[PDB]
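Why predict the complex rather than its parts? Because the way molecules touch one another can change local conformation, and only a joint prediction can capture that. The input here totals 805 residues.
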Amino acid sequence: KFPRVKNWELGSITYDTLCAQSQQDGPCTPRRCLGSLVLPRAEQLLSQARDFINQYYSSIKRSGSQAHEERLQEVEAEVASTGTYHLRESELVFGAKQAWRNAPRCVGRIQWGKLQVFDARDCSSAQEMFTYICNHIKYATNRGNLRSAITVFPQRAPGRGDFRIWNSQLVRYAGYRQQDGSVRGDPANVEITELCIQHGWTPGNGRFDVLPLLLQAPDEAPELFVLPPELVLEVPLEHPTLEWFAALGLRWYALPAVSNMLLEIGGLEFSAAPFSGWYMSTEIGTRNLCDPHRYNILEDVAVCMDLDTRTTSSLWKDKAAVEINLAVLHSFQLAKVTIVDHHAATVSFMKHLDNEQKARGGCPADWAWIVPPISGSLTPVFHQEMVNYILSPAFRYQPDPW
Amino acid sequence: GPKFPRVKNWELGSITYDTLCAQSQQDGPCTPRRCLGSLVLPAEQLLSQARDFINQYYSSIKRSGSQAHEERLQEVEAEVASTGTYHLRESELVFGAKQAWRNAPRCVGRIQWGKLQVFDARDCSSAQEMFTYICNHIKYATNRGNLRSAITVFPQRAPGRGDFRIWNSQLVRYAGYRQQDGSVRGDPANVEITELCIQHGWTPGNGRFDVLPLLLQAPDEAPELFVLPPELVLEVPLEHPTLEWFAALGLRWYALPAVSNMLLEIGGLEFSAAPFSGWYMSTEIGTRNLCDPHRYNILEDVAVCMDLDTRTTSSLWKDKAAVEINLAVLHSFQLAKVTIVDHHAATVSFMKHLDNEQKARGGCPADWAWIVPPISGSLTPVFHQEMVNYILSPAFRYQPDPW
Ligand code: HEM
Ligand code: HEM
Ligand SMILES: N=C(NCCC[C@H](N)CN(O)CCN)N[N+](=O)[O-]
Ligand SMILES: N=C(NCCC[C@H](N)CN(O)CCN)N[N+](=O)[O-]
Ligand SMILES: C[C@H](O)[C@H](O)[C@H]1CNc2nc(N)[nH]c(=O)c2N1
Ligand SMILES: C[C@H](O)[C@H](O)[C@H]1CNc2nc(N)[nH]c(=O)c2N1
Ligand SMILES: [Zn+2]
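Output of the joint prediction:
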């Protein structure tokens, strides 16, 4: 019933009792494990609402109190007559922090308690969404001293369209499909780039053109907004000892801000609730720059390093990858922009695991996502068994609005 | 769409559906409530398992429903009927052993599955004879550096009688000597088997790479100790292609990886002693065996020799040192003409295996956490391939230590 969890480097054992609190099914069954797959293939609401309110009052050490009992009545009254309800700002703040804390694929959760929550539920137009987004970016960027934040737009409502941010992140580089099939820029963003153009954006022709935002108010066509360049901090990439690296003209933006995930709290759903923390260097240096379906610069860098790209056995791919990740760290450090390397991040996650074991009896974690894309076993998390399950409040994927 | 798991490759955008998982008859550790995919170790019945295996065998030779098939099924039911168990024919053992390998979710080398050399040692009746069979396996498999995959199958577990067992986890292992200061000289992973060898009369050495003797156990007898003739255990001294000082570290590793404590299950029959061997994927040695903190842990030593800043994580000193250590392993095995496969070549071959199996059986059970190499994960194609994990039989399974 309760899984035994072992760390093979230290030989230590724990038991995950928190998983018993999961109310939502994942993709696995006793016949087959689908743990490596990326995407999944009124009384109910009232049930989730009560559970959430209970979590909230327990967090402020006031369960059973009068305020607790009265709040539960309010929620019951609102759902019974309207089919839905609304969260108080303090609950929204607690809810967003818990969603982060519960996110199995996030290795930066040691920071979960420090999140600036912007209540944007009084938003009635895409124009207003844009203003809130600009303020989020300014605050979060903070001149390179990044601060974790989330801006929460109006919840979903029955028979009414959702407030949505079409872009997957607030800052993304365009991907222009070229005549000969290739892509200029970021291949992951070809679809959104095209949508922007289709909606009147005058495209650029570079490899790092910041995309405009396509923001959508309920039941309206999305609207295009160009981000003020001075609000988008970027870091030109250079290498500490390889002088020619800068000549590659590579760069990446400072702020990672997921904008297409749904935040679920107490049964309520927030379809637009962009959040941001700071990058772990491998996200940029390894995946964004070296993925074959992304900027795919490994071969170029290897040739500049004059490595033997003739055979795999020369480990040219491994050598180039390391220097690229080193360039990212060096460059962010030089530009004085917050970033965390994969060793420091995983070491902090092990502390988080321990903190959560004591606090809640476990921590849902997705091993395939927590272990870094390079040097996996050189990090502590590789040797740590993990149990994955869904807790609520939660961040979850949702269909693209188009 | 299809009511089977949909599997996507994110690098290529391609999709397949796994229908082979429908054939699984054993539950894994996961439930809809929680995934335990990252955990390392998470007559009526015999007849059904036996019948299923016979059906698999006849299906494989394209004779399902034939007179021979029905007669073999009859024969197995009667043998189990009067004796409680049954025995496999030679070709059934060969088919079952290859299928067990083919079915192994944690093995990235499965493209080679059809080439296994199956040594039938089911006539073995003593520990001394087990040793002879094992030495022949080592000689055949090593083939002076041009390694050949092989498995030697000893007698199956029998009702009442004791089990045939090889106590060591691999045929070649380096001793791990517990020190006064509490540290370990040699391989920390082998501290327990090393002590057991000593408790059984082995006179211990005092080096970092002392090859351990084998503790072989015949039915209902105490284990017997046998030391492998040095001439038979091929080793490779490690040197680096450019860093001249690497050779001075005195590191080395043996050529033959030969798992000896896994149980081979075929049609319900259990072969407690069936050592198998292929060849190493370089990261097993260069990354795990040499750099794991709980193994040889040589990362800091090598980083210091490379004059890296081991004071801060940000210098990526662990990453740089690990890459050079893996390169030294590949370079040295290549120099010594001993078969080895780097993690890029191996994962590329595994992607081909997945495509072959998609066509041949409708899927391939695979454990993502084990298939993706310990270094440079996303630089290999398997990192971007979703995988379905499930248990198929014949199979190789873990079994408790005999002591
Ligand atoms: C403070 C610094 C933070 C760091 C260093 C960090 C790091 C990471 C990393 C490396 C991943 C995997 C990303 C990928 O491979 O695409 C991730 C995923 C995630 N993080 Fe964090 N994180 C941080 C802050 C946040 C914040 C502020 C939230 C939400 C309030 C959050 C929510 C999540 C979620 C939900 C995912 C999964 C996204 C997906 O499935 O695509 N993270 N994080
Ligand atoms: C021909 C070359 C082969 C290569 C390169 C290869 C490579 C690998 C690798 C890299 C692993 C993971 C090992 C670890 O991380 O400890 C593995 C595991 C495994 N392989 Fe293969 N393998 C080969 C041949 C074989 C053969 C001949 C068999 C059996 C007939 C086999 C059965 C298995 C099994 C059952 C495991 C899992 C062992 C465990 O769970 O500890 N492999 N293989
Ligand atoms: N450091 C962070 N990295 C997350 C960015 C990409 C992630 N795949 C989200 N995403 O695109 C989800 C949509 N499929 N987060 N952060 O600090 O806020
Ligand atoms: N390349 C190979 N590597 C096998 C390494 C040991 C593995 N951990 C099994 N093992 O010792 C199981 C014990 N718990 N195999 N081979 O080629 O035959
Ligand atoms: C197929 C496989 O699940 C997929 O490539 C996963 C693996 N681990 C990952 N881990 C992180 N952090 N981010 C990712 O995008 C992925 N991709
Ligand atoms: C805890 C975690 O499951 C464990 O460290 C696994 C991860 N992946 C692995 N993969 C391979 N090939 N071999 C291993 O020993 C491991 N160890
Ligand atoms: Zn699972």
